[PDB]
Design a binder for this molecule. Structure first.
Ligand SMILES: Nc1ncnc2c1ncn2[C@@H]1O[C@H](COP(=O)(O)OP(=O)(O)OP(=O)(O)O)[C@@H](O)[C@H]1O
Ligand SMILES: Nc1ncnc2c1ncn2[C@@H]1O[C@H](COP(=O)(O)OP(=O)(O)OP(=O)(O)O)[C@@H](O)[C@H]1O
Ligand SMILES: [Mg+2]
Ligand SMILES: [Mg+2]
Ligand code: NA
Ligand code: NA
Lengths: 305, 305
């Protein structure tokens, strides 16, 4: 049994954070325990939203209960979006402790900080978080999944090309994580302008390095939860395929493809044909993608670099 | 799309409340939205447990969020263990409005009040809840899943034989729900002393327009151990299987009870292997019962009443 302590948001309607991470990991047989960092009616991409958060003391309270029963032994830890600096610090103390309890623990960190829209990036988290991430979180992380913007912020240098991107990943590797994966980038593709690029690098002794590239066909709308889903599925596939970033990223990415495909279709069907689908209609068709998650048909071959 | 609003407990580790009802319903294709009434480290049957609870005001706020985004359109509402009277009264108003929004909404209500342990029964929620359930909840419920003790508290009648059970079930129908299932009772079993009894009663109008009633009975072999979350699982699967077989209580129940069996069988084996088994080893082996949840092999046929 593989246990995962996943600490992320919970929303009542929709799929983001733990909602996007849990089902798929459960479907793939993991014992994922979800610590809901917040509980909102839905994600902030909607016009409205209400909810309550979980403060650092409550997080600790929860960990203590787990400790008391000797349930503080996990195989992986998964974290994503957080707005509170106090919360992040508490998360760090927990991974450290869980790591002492089980040194083999793999910490999967999604350093959610911001994104680039047109080519300009803007953080959607307070700045005081960046240093914590650079100095406390990443060093403890074994696997990190930043998008292009987050990889830039974390290293201090802009990524203009693929080679610059790979240099930035090298920097992150030295910061601690043995597995780095850029989940999206403005990088150009020879396949056309309708593409976003994914880059992945893994450091594993034998020391041997593995680097892969993937050119994903862009879809018309804006999704929410896909980053979180990418992180959880990476966790899942690097677990079944350790020492194979290639396949692990192919299954991860193929899973997302199917899900988004199913989502964009039903989304356009509901929305009046010719009309841009709303955030509500654009919620991931998670439940309906069950079979694609269990065994994703590979539809994007990754090229070795 | 079949949308379910499930307001129940959440735990980090283990499967009870919403943790026991979500994965299975998701596996079965339902868009189940979970509103976590509490967030504990684990269920209260463990030596220890820490956590926070959701109070009526925050529930209302969470509801407000859905409302503002016009996402308060559900096909089913599902509730279970509720600890606070003002919360239950909030759950009641919520359901009342969801029903105004969609008259076809089916409220599946598991009236958690207590259970028989010795030969005696005792409550495990504030006694000032009983009147609320009697006067506000049950009247709104369409499907209720009380155990024997609860069917007695709601009816103000004690059940000593199969016939008093049926009499009580009729009383329960007159209070509101068209479907009443007694999820466990001591009652005599032609197959021995180690058998708990399940009783089902469903009233419905058939095509012609005649109001009829289906009655079933099931004798389950008692296993030597205490499980937590199985009541929640029973209700969850009841919802799901009466949804597929609306005019057939026999099949819905046989499938519901059969799933519990499979889950319980697999759970007891991995418990004996690890051990008496503590609460932790008797945690329902949920993720591992995926197949059985999807297509449960009927292993206990119901006798018709
Ligand atoms: N518009 C899209 N078209 C095609 N694929 C997409 C699209 N949006 C997201 N994806 C899929 O989701 C993956 C992650 O991209 P996304 O932008 O959602 O997350 P991110 O910004 O990289 O990370 P995060 O949101 O956690 O900071 C992409 O690699 C791709 O597989
Ligand atoms: N010890 C057991 N042996 C066999 N089956 C069991 C056992 N415990 C629970 N079950 C299964 O779970 C079902 C519900 O029983 P359980 O006692 O868990 O809930 P309940 O007491 O009837 O209702 P609630 O717990 O919600 O108040 C039983 O009908 C049976 O299908
Ligand atoms: Mg992005
Ligand atoms: Mg019981
Ligand atoms: Na990312
Ligand atoms: Na019950």
């Amino acid at each position: 049994e593989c246990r995962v302590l996943s600490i992320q948001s919970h929303v009542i309607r929709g799929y983001v954070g733990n909602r996007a991470a849990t089902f798929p990991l459960q479907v793939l047989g993991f014992e994922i325990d979800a610590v809901n960092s917040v509980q909102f009616s839905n994600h902030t991409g909607y016009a409205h939203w209400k909810g309550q958060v979980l403060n650092s003391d409550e997080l600790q309270e929860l960990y203590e209960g787990l400790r008391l029963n000797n349930m503080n032994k996990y195989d992986y830890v998964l974290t994503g979006y957080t707005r509170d600096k106090s919360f992040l610090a508490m998360v760090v103390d927990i991974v450290q402790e869980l790591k002492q309890q089980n040194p083999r623990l793999v910490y999967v960190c999604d350093p959610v900080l911001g994104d680039k829209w047109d080519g300009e990036g803007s953080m959607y988290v307070p700045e005081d978080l960046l240093p914590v991430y650079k100095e406390k979180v990443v060093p403890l992380a074994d696997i990190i999944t930043p998008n292009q913007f987050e990889a830039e912020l974390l290293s201090g240098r802009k990524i203009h090309s693929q080679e610059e991107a790979l240099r930035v990943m090298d920097m992150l590797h030295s910061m601690g994580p043995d597995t780095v994966v850029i989940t999206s980038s403005d990088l150009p593709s020879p396949q056309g302008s309708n593409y976003l690029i994914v880059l992945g690098s893994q450091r594993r002794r034998n020391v041997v390095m593995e680097r892969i590239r993937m050119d994903i066909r862009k879809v018309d709308a804006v999704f929410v939860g896909t980053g979180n889903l990418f992180a959880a599925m990476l966790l899942a596939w690097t677990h079944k395929h350790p020492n194979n970033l290639k396949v692990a990223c192919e299954k991860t990415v193929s899973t997302l493809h199917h899900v988004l495909q199913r989502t964009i279709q039903c989304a356009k069907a509901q929305a009046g044909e010719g009309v841009r689908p709303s955030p509500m209609q654009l919620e991931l068709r998670m439940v309906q993608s069950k079979r694609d998650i269990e065994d994703p048909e590979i539809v994007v071959q990754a090229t070795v670099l």
